[PDB]
């Protein structure tokens, strides 16, 4: 354990970041997806019709 | 200015008049019946009845109607909108006895000759085949449509060719017998008329008469062979009765690429407030930008001088005896149909002079900013920006 600890004196430090990163990405990915789907809904509902005279 | 005196008869028909010293008169019948009251199975009934209404009534078979109203020397006109129908005549005041009678038969016991029925069907249809030439009307009939979706207001006054071909006397008879009720009718007279004589003539003749939501949207009819592009952008107008309409008219008077007109079309608690402009394709984008800037400009540049300016131009738009009989009648008929009363010009002047810059930018901010627009484009409209872009002035 000690050897491991020394090899990566930051092992603990990091995993806390990674936990904060997972929580922030779980918050931010559906919200950015919802924006994208807002601004892309317009087109995704566009109905085209061909009306030759 | 002489007051507009209103009486009410048995039927419920109102008889409004505004005497003036001009010599001729414009006597008309308004009816609260348009394409908004049609239910997509009779979408051209008002238009086709407006064609059939001058082709003879029992009393005036054949060309009699046109002949007499021609002999008397009067001009016979009719029009139909999405909410109102008007059948008006301008004639020598001494012709009042004649006039009222003729008009009566136009709006009642009108005898639609199926012979004529077929004929008009063809007329309407063929013209429609060419009504496509009126690009502006096209732009304005999809704007209505694109915005007022799933609502009666959408259906155009003309109606779909389909219906035009598929219409019969009985259907017409229905529209006639359904939307021509006496409480929904105004007999308006302007010019050299006496109100008591007109009331007696209305008692003698015509005494027998028996949702909407705005949807942000966009319709881009692309046809690159046309030389010019017409684009209309609108938001939801307050309505006909809403007081803020006046502060919006002043805003339009502030705005006043090419043919950049501005409109405030009002229907019963709804409407379209916006701008229509025709430009070469390459400039469409720029023009769009400009318009948007101006609107936010009202929100930010209501210089008192300009405020006054707009008030003054509005002041010189109000219709009056000077404008003439027809203009006035028309105003009497619309005022009795929409407001239920004739608003005098002094009240209009009071509502204009109470408008200042702060309430103008308040009323504008409520309606232009953060309001999904309805866009209708026709022509070479590839450089016309798409919705996300348009709604996003960002400035």
UniProtKB/Swiss-Prot annotation, chain A:
Q: So which stretches are on the Mitochondrial matrix side?
A: 38-53
What are the transmembrane regions? 17-37
Where does the record place it? Mitochondrion inner membrane
**UniProt superkingdom:** Eukaryota
Q: Which cysteines link up through disulfide bonds?
A: none
Q: What does this protein do?
A: Component of the ubiquinol-cytochrome c oxidoreductase, a multisubunit transmembrane complex that is part of the mitochondrial electron transport chain which drives oxidative phosphorylation.
Record's subunit section: Component of the ubiquinol-cytochrome c oxidoreductase (cytochrome b-c1 complex, complex III, CIII), a multisubunit enzyme composed of 11 subunits. The complex is composed of 3 respiratory subunits cytochrome b, cytochrome c1 and Rieske protein UQCRFS1, 2 core protein subunits UQCRC1/QCR1 and UQCRC2/QCR2, and 6 low-molecular weight protein subunits UQCRH/QCR6, UQCRB/QCR7, UQCRQ/QCR8, UQCR10/QCR9, UQCR11/QCR10 and subunit 9, the cleavage product of Rieske protein UQCRFS1.
Record-stated family: Belongs to the cytochrome c family.
Protein's UniProt name: Cytochrome c1, heme protein, mitochondrial
Taxonomic source organism: Mus musculus
**Included range, full protein:** 272 to 324 of 325
UniProtKB/Swiss-Prot annotation, chain B:
Specify the superkingdom.
Answer: Eukaryota
State the compartments where it is located. Answer: Mitochondrion inner membrane
> Which Gene3D superfamilies does the entry mention?
Metalloenzyme, LuxS/M16 peptidase-like
Q: What is its main location?
A: mitochondrion
SUPFAM superfamilies linked: LuxS/MPP-like metallohydrolase
Q: Does the keyword Aminoacyl-tRNA synthetase apply?
A: no
Protein name (database record): Cytochrome b-c1 complex subunit 1, mitochondrial
Can you name the source organism?
A: Mus musculus
